Amino acid sequence: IIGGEFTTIENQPWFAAIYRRHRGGSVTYVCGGSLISPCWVISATHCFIDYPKKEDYIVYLGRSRLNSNTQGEMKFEVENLILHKDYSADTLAHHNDIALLKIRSKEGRCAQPSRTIQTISLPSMYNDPQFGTSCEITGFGKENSTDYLYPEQLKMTVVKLISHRECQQPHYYGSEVTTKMLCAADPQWKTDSCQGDSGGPLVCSLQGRMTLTGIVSWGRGCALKDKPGVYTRVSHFLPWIRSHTKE
Numbered sequence: 001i002i003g004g005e006f007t008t009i010e011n012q013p014w015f016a017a018i019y020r021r022h023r024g025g026s027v028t029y030v031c032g033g034s035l036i037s038p039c040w041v042i043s044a045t046h047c048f049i050d051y052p053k054k055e056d057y058i059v060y061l062g063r064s065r066l067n068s069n070t071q072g073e074m075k076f077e078v079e080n081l082i083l084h085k086d087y088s089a090d091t092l093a094h095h096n097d098i099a100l101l102k103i104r105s106k107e108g109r110c111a112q113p114s115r116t117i118q119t120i121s122l123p124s125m126y127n128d129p130q131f132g133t134s135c136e137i138t139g140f141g142k143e144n145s146t147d148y149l150y151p152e153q154l155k156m157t158v159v160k161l162i163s164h165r166e167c168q169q170p171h172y173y174g175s176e177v178t179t180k181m182l183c184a185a186d187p188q189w190k191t192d193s194c195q196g197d198s199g200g201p202l203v204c205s206l207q208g209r210m211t212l213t214g215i216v217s218w219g220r221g222c223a224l225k226d227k228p229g230v231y232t233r234v235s236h237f238l239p240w241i242r243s244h245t246k247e
């Protein structure tokens with residue numbers, strides 16, 4: 001997150017931190033995610049496309065810091081890694097950037113709701129906020145494009161949803177952006193999501209209720225003028241989500 005502010009898991013209880021184990025003994029941060037049900041975390045497919053091995057991942061809930069523990073945190077293995085079959089990446093655009101991680105503790109249990117661990121609500125079929133609405137994003141991503149390290153403490157910021165027409169302008173993204181994606185940015189181009197925030201949640205208050213509106217996917221640079229962040233439009237994936245979360 002460029003700009004914004006530091007926060008705690010208490011304020012983003014549905015946030016999931018995904019790490020990857022390495023041949024040696026070190027575990028590196030991969031992507032963010034959101035808990036949508038006790039046994040399910042939703043994220044982005046591009047985060048795992050190069051290493052589809054479920055055994056190498058670790059998911060944390062109730063975690064506020066990158067490389068240190070937090071009271072009340074819970075560690076989970078990935079029982080099942082589901083990537084989208086039609087995921088593809090073009091010059092800029094990432095299509096169908098969505099993925100599901102079924103989780104389970106060593107005892108074989110799913111998440112237990114606490115004050116630092118809660119699920120986020122999914123939207124209604126084709127029911128998204130009005131353009132111009134304010135939403136929040138969270139992540140352990142870069143604070144500046146020139147950094148090579150991720151901040152130690154979770155962060156968040158607020159951005160505005162941009163119409164598909166504005167985002168489709170020539171100086172923006174043109175036809176790279178489709179209706180299966182949502183653009184959002186700061187009107188002053190000061191704050192934005194960045195590398196490392198991928199898979200994270202784009203939360204909007206819809207009719208008095210926190211809804212998982214989008215997933216951090218791509219963008220040209222970070223907080224660049226006329227280059228909004230692009231998010232996977234969760235509302236247009238409800239069928240895919242339901243059919244894979246069954247059995």
Ligand SMILES: N=C(N)c1ccc(CNC(=O)[C@H](COCc2ccccc2)NC(=O)[C@@H](CO)NS(=O)(=O)Cc2ccccc2)cc1
Binds near residue numbers: 090091223224
């Ligand atoms: N709101 C934003 N401005 C914003 C939001 C989220 C992200 C995270 N996603 C990525 O970085 C994704 C990762 O895809 C890797 C990949 C490629 C191929 C297969 C798998 C994975 N890539 C992009 O977006 C590309 C276009 O496809 N543009 S960029 O190179 O300009 C991103 C960047 C900016 C500063 C420093 C390093 C990289 C970046 C920017």
